[PDB]
Structure formats: structure tokens, C-alpha cells
Amino acid sequence: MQDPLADMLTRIRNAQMAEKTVVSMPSSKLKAAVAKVLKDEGYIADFQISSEVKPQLSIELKYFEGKPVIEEVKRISRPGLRQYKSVEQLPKVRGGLGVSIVSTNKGVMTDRAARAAGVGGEVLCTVF
Amino acid sequence: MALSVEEKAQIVNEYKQAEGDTGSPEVQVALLSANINKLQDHFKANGKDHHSRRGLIRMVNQRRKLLDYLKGKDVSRYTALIGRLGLRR
Amino acid sequence: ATINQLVRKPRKRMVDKSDVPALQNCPQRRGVCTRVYTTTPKKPNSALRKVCRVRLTNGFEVSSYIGGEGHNLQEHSVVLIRGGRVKDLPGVRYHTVRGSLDTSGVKDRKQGRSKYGAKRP
RNA sequence: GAAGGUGCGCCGGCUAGGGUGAAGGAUUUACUCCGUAAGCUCUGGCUGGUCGAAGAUACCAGGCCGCUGCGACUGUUUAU
RNA sequence: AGUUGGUGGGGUAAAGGCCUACCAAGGCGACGAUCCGUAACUGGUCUGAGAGGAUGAUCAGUCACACUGGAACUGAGACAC
RNA sequence: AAGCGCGCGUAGGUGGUUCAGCAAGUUGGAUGUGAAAUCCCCGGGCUCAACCUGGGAACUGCAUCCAAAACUACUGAGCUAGAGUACGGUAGAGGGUGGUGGAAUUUCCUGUGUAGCGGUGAAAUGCGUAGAUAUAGGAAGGAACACCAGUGGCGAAGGCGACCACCUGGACUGAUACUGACACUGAGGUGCGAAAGCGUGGGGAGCAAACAGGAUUAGAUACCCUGGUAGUCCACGCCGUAAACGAUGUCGACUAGCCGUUGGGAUCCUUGAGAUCUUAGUGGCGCAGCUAACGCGAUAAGUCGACCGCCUGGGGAGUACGGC
RNA sequence: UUACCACGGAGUGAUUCAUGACUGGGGUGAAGUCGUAACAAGGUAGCCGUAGGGGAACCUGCGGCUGGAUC
Ligand SMILES: [Mg+2]
Ligand SMILES: [Mg+2]
Numbered sequence A: 001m002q003d004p005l006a007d008m009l010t011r012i013r014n015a016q017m018a019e020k021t022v023v024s025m026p027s028s029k030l031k032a033a034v035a036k037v038l039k040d041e042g043y044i045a046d047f048q049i050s051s052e053v054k055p056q057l058s059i060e061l062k063y064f065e066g067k068p069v070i071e072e073v074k075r076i077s078r079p080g081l082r083q084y085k086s087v088e089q090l091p092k093v094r095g096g097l098g099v100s101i102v103s104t105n106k107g108v109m110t111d112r113a114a115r116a117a118g119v120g121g122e123v124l125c126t127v128f
Numbered sequence B: 001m002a003l004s005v006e007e008k009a010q011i012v013n014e015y016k017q018a019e020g021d022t023g024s025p026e027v028q029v030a031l032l033s034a035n036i037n038k039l040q041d042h043f044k045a046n047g048k049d050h051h052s053r054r055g056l057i058r059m060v061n062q063r064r065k066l067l068d069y070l071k072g073k074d075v076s077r078y079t080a081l082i083g084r085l086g087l088r089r
Numbered sequence C: 001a002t003i004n005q006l007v008r009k010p011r012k013r014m015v016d017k018s019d020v021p022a023l024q025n026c027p028q029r030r031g032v033c034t035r036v037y038t039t040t041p042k043k044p045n046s047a048l049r050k051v052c053r054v055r056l057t058n059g060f061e062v063s064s065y066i067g068g069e070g071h072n073l074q075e076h077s078v079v080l081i082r083g084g085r086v087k088d089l090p091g092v093r094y095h096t097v098r099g100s101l102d103t104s105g106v107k108d109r110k111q112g113r114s115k116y117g118a119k120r121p
Numbered sequence D: 001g002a003a004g005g006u007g008c009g010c011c012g013g014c015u016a017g018g019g020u021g022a023a024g025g026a027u028u029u030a031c032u033c034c035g036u037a038a039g040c041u042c043u044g045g046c047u048g049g050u051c052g053a054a055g056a057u058a059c060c061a062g063g064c065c066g067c068u069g070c071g072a073c074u075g076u077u078u079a080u
Numbered sequence E: 001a002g003u004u005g006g007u008g009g010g011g012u013a014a015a016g017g018c019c020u021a022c023c024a025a026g027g028c029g030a031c032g033a034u035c036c037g038u039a040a041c042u043g044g045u046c047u048g049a050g051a052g053g054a055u056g057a058u059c060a061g062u063c064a065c066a067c068u069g070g071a072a073c074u075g076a077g078a079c080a081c
Numbered sequence F: 001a002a003g004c005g006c007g008c009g010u011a012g013g014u015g016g017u018u019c020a021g022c023a024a025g026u027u028g029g030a031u032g033u034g035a036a037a038u039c040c041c042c043g044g045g046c047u048c049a050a051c052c053u054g055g056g057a058a059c060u061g062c063a064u065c066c067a068a069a070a071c072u073a074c075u076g077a078g079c080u081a082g083a084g085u086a087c088g089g090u091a092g093a094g095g096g097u098g099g100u101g102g103a104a105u106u107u108c109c110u111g112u113g114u115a116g117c118g119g120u121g122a123a124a125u126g127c128g129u130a131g132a133u134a135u136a137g138g139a140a141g142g143a144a145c146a147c148c149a150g151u152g153g154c155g156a157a158g159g160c161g162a163c164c165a166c167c168u169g170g171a172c173u174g175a176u177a178c179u180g181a182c183a184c185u186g187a188g189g190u191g192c193g194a195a196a197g198c199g200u201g202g203g204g205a206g207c208a209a210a211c212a213g214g215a216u217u218a219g220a221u222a223c224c225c226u227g228g229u230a231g232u233c234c235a236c237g238c239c240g241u242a243a244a245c246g247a248u249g250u251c252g253a254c255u256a257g258c259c260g261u262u263g264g265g266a267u268c269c270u271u272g273a274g275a276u277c278u279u280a281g282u283g284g285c286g287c288a289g290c291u292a293a294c295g296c297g298a299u300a301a302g303u304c305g306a307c308c309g310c311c312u313g314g315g316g317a318g319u320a321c322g323g324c
Numbered sequence G: 001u002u003a004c005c006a007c008g009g010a011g012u013g014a015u016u017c018a019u020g021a022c023u024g025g026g027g028u029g030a031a032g033u034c035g036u037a038a039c040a041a042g043g044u045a046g047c048c049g050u051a052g053g054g055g056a057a058c059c060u061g062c063g064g065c066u067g068g069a070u071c
């Protein structure tokens, strides 16, 4: 309703508790772009956009040993409290093993790349 | 829903923005205003009808919300609507 | 809890009142004894504790415990009172420092002499 | 009028408005309307000076406050 | 109700209701005005992993005060320990 | 210990999706400033240390300028997923105003008829020979609507049960048509809000605080019995509280299933008559998950997001004082 | 001599502190009197709001709830 992005993570998180294979939900620039980071990071197998006037976003999910690959996904920059960090202040999820997706001005992209690119932005969510 | 289908069909065409238009705010506000004014006669005779007054208040709040949205969109269209309907008392 | 609810009204911190109000942020005060008496402790204990009512230099009237065995204090005796209450004595919240001004230290004390104002022999 | 306080006479300088009102104009229809300079008349405002012990100067013209009993109140009554 | 603006004038080393004459009815306030209690402020100090909490000795910067109230004089500079 | 009794709604907070612009937020850099001392890092001098001191770091801030346009804010233009309107229909104790009906109670009148009736654990107060109770016929009056009746229905909640007529709100349901974010929440504020209670006027059958009498009891200001006033009923005002409870704020999204039930819709069955999906409610189990446990478990107390209200040991005390 | 103005004076309020015959509740007590109200179906289920009554816990009526036993 008032946070379509957090709807994406919770839809993903609920499915992995229920051992579902694919999920469907309306798409957007942020939803598709965050799916880009997740797929290139290996947390999701693949994502497609059903290009119609009302587009969906479909994610097929990954399980390694039955346990879902994404152990935990947590929203950070909620609409009630938008969170902005500098390059030095960007979070490190689980000591660098995880990824904290940060929407910088060079597109949506991970915290590891943001430090390399030397740009901060809005810390959207943390993954592990 | 105290307005008959004839009265509803009467006021929709005088306030429609185009043919087949029944959802434009002018139609909505005119639809609510005619129902609001009609119910005034009932509440005069029935002063203890607190349960039907909840619906009347909702129609009043709905009309206010529509007029505030029409305020943001086109102030000239808003001005003609209340002048024709005699609102903003 | 809501971050908006906190913005309007910040979290409030209670300030606990001191358990020694008559001492008034001082380590000790000087007072005179107005009444020397003995009182009975609560349910578990049963004894005759020596407590004296002290009129402090700031006008406060309080009762403080007299520690040790035997005391030489009577009416109109200048004493120094320190903080710390007595749990089995109702209404007693101060201790009388032995070995200062009129209240002499306990006689024949050998262990823990400094706490009771006892000379070294 | 709780209580309590300030000003107040007289003579100048400046100044704001009522009313009435020949003219003139209008309806130059008539016991008509608008309006009118001066003159009379009423109400103010801002300043300055001045006399006395005293300016609401005489006559005229509330004393006031606090607690409490009774009757709610205006009224009526033992003409004497 | 000089209260908040405007206009003329005065006044200051200097702008300004700083003051005054006149005109208008303005100005501040739940984003806490006004009032009450407390209090010199800061760099800093203590504690805390940090975020924070408590505090404003020594030293340093600013401020205010000089037995109480007020006032000016001189002087570049004071309303002057 | 803590969800306001419940709605609506002001300020505020937050807001679906697409394109373009801008650059306040946001990001990077530069410049000025952020006094010195202190904190910190590397050294130096007191025999070491405390101490002093060199340089650096920092002062997480502010101001200006330059770059960037993912997100927020703004601007402009759109879209239909939210929200809403137009149409047909369905169910309902939803509300208001008037009539009408049946059963029953009570009171009164009349007939029959004669020693009890009523009550209790048993009694007694009480009623009855002035003819009670019972029975039959008639009349008046008030209140509530048996069966239907159902973890059934409607309502924001409090609540709403006889029937009919009139006035009127909402919900559910199907497709098409239309507006195009018009939304959510909501401090103040405002409206409704059981029962009791209060005011004015009516009404008063049953019931029944108070009250009276009879029992019981050591006592019985009660439980039980006999009466019985306010009240309960109506209209217009006031009150504004309940264990006002699901002890669970509202709104939106997601997450195995199984068995009932109410109002619809679609398809097989067109079946005569069942079955399968779907929706809005209403219940019982239950995987996962949560929980201190009890338990919740698509009507979440699970995974989230927006907003609001509230809690900070027990008593004192939701009391005193002041305000409304 | 006028204007400004300190001290001082007058009246009338507000607020705060301390006391005050008497009076109300609250807490703590080594335990005294009267009952036994709640906890079991606590021996009349309890509790919530309200009203009336009573030495007292309490009782009674009206509505509500289960945070009630048996079934
Ligand atoms: Mg007397
Ligand atoms: Mg009299």
C-alpha cells in the first residue's frame, strides 16, 4: 500500500518459509531493479517482467540444501524513516558475507560496489 | 439511495463532462448534493434517526473530499461547480 | 514507540529522589540530639537499637542510628550524621559517625576500628 | 457606582464634524426634490498661557468594606 | 496599543518605534507565545562499546556584576571594582 | 503495566504506476570557517612517570560553489491495480414514525361451588365463611413479543427479535460504462454511546432497589417467603460511564490444508438434483511460524508496511489539589 | 521653571511558603473486639458500571462479562 518495495521482500520471505518455487507481484522500476541486484548476486535464480499494461514481476527461487539461500531479508529505508548513508557509513551485513542493497546515483547496486564506486545513497534492504 | 433513477438520470446529464460520463467529480458532487438536500426533509420529520444520519454525514464528507481534489486539479472547474450548485456556505 | 510519536514527545527519564534529603548533597551534616531512645525492629529481628533524634544545621529533624556497643550521648549533644539507612528500623535513614564531636568511639574495639572511631592501642 | 484613582476655572492658537440655510440646479409639474455662501446653532480634538489656599468652588449632590442570623426577591401590615 | 507597520521630523559614531507627531489595526502564539521555578553560556569534564546520559571546578573565549537603586561627566574607548 | 467504548474528521505523518524536467533532500569533491588548550596518533625533554612540548589527526557542524539524477520532495503530462460513481438484483431483529394481532399476567363485574388457597426444607406473615382458590362469561389496562430461532442476520460500536404501511442508511452481488490516486491514519475537535441515574410531563399489568412483616440463625440491617415505592414503559432534555471484552486500534499485502454455515455469482447436471471453483461474512481443527506458557494460527497473537493511542514495580491512587 | 526618573507612599489583586482549633482518609505496627466478605459451586458463583440500604467486611435491584463449579 504505502511501501511497495517492502512488499517485494516480504513476498519473497514468506515464500521461502513455505518452500514455494515462484512468486508473482506487480512490477516497478525499483522492484525490477532490486531483482537485478539479487539475481546478479545469486540469491534469486532469475526474474522476468511480463510486459503488459499491468506488468507482473516473477521470481523463481533458489534452495541449496532445502534451506532457502536467503536466510534473512530485512527492509531498512522504510517510508516512515528513510535512511541515507555515506560511502564510509554503508552497512556491512554479517561482516561482508551478506549484501546491503543501496540505491546510489549510479543506479541500484550493492554496498560492495558502492564503496568501490565511492558513492552513497539510500540503504534499501539487507540480505543474507 | 433516496434519489430515484429518474432524478439520478436527470442530474447526471446536466453535470456530465462528456457523453457517458458518470464518474467525473462534477457528477459525483452534484449527485451527493441532490441527495444531501433531499435527506434534509426526512431528518426534519425524523430527528431521532441517528443511524441514517451516519450515512448522510458520509455523503457530506465524500462531497468535501471530491471538492478538495477538484481544487487541486482545476480551480476554474471547481469555481463553476460550486456556483452552479450553490456550495461553499 | 513509533518514531513519529517519539519526535513530538521524547523519551522521559525519571530522576530518583535521594534517600538522604536532610543531608542536602553533602557527605555529612552537624546536628544536636533532641531525644535519645531505643526502638524495636520489624518482624524477624528483636533488639533494642539506640536511635537519637537530631536537629540538623539546616533545620531538618531526623533520627539516625547509633552504631557500636554503648554510647555516651544524651540530650543537647553535638553529633555528625552520615548517610545509609537501617533496614529493620522503620524511619531511620542516617548513621551517626562515632569518633567526631561529642559521640566518642566505642570502648575496647579492636577490629574495624576506623568505621567506629576507635583509637589504636 | 464594588473598592480605588486621574482630570475639571478662565483666556488664547490650530483643527474636525451636526443641523438649518439666499443662491443656483433639477421635476424650471409645485405646500416638489437636490443643494447652498454668509449668518445662527450643537458636538468635539490637539496644544499653550494664566489666577487663586482652593475651579464638580455656592445651592445641589452615594460614605465604604469584612464576617454572621432571619426572610428568597418587588410588595403588605398594628390610622394614633 | 509604541504595541505592529507607514509618512514627516528629531536622535545615534551607525540602521532601527531609538524618540516623537499623524494615519492604519496591526504584531506574536500548540512549530508553545505569555507566565512560574531554576540557571551564567561555550571549548570542554565525568561516565559509556557506541548512541547517549550527567555536568559547566582548575585553564581558555564571551557575558553580567562591583555595598543596594539610579544618573550622567570626562575620555578614542565607561555609564567606570 | 499498557488498544481510547466506538465512528467521522482538522493540523500533521505517510502515500499505487509510467515518461520528462528541476535539484531542496540525497551522494562525491573543492573552498571558507569550525579560536587556543584538552581527547587521540607518532616523536622530543625532565634519571622514568605524573608533567611539558613539536607535528598530525579530529572538531561527526555550518555556509558557498561545482558535478550526478537511483529514491524522496516539487513541476508538467499520462495509466488503472487503490478509491469512487452510473445500472439490475439479493438478504437482513439496521434506524425512525404510526397503526394492528395473539398468548399470558393483574384488577374489576357476574354465575356455579365450598373449606381451604398461597408459600416453604418445614413453617409463618398473607388471602379466605363479608364465600377465597378453582371454574365459566364479560370488561379495562400496561408490558414483552412463545414456536420460527440457528458459534443465524444486520449495525462503526452501544445495540436491534410480533405483523403491516410510510420515511430512510448501509452491505453483498454481475457485467459493462465513467473519474483517474481523488488514498490511509489521525493529536486537537466533533458525533453516537448498555444499564443505572437526573429533570419536565404522561403511564403503570408483571417485576422490584428502598421500606414493612414472617422465617432461619448465637446474631441476620442477607440468602428464603409474603407485600411493596422509586424504577423498569412513552416523549423531550441531561449524564457519558461498564468485564463498553475478542480483555486483541485502523488500513494494505503475503503464508499448507481439512470440516460446517449465511448472502450471492460462475461451470459441470439443463437434471428431477447434487458436485467443482470464486466472493463477502460467520465458526471448529490444524502444517509452518510465534509465544514465558496457556494458546494464536487467512477472522494471526506468523512475515511485513503507514499512522495513532497507551505502559515503565506494588500500595498510596485513578485518590488529593486546580481546570473543564 | 517644565519633561524624564530612583527612593518612598496608597489602594486592590495574584501566587508561593509556614503555621491553625477541629476534621477526613492513607500507611505501618508485638497483637485486642465484632463478624467471616473473597479463594473449592468458599457453602447465596464471582467481578464490572450504577443506584439504594446497612456497625463492618458487605447486601439488594438493573444491565454486562467469564477472569464460574457440576452437567
Ligand atoms: Mg447568633
Ligand atoms: Mg422580606
Ligand SMILES: [Mg+2]
Pocket: D078
Ligand atoms: Mg402604630
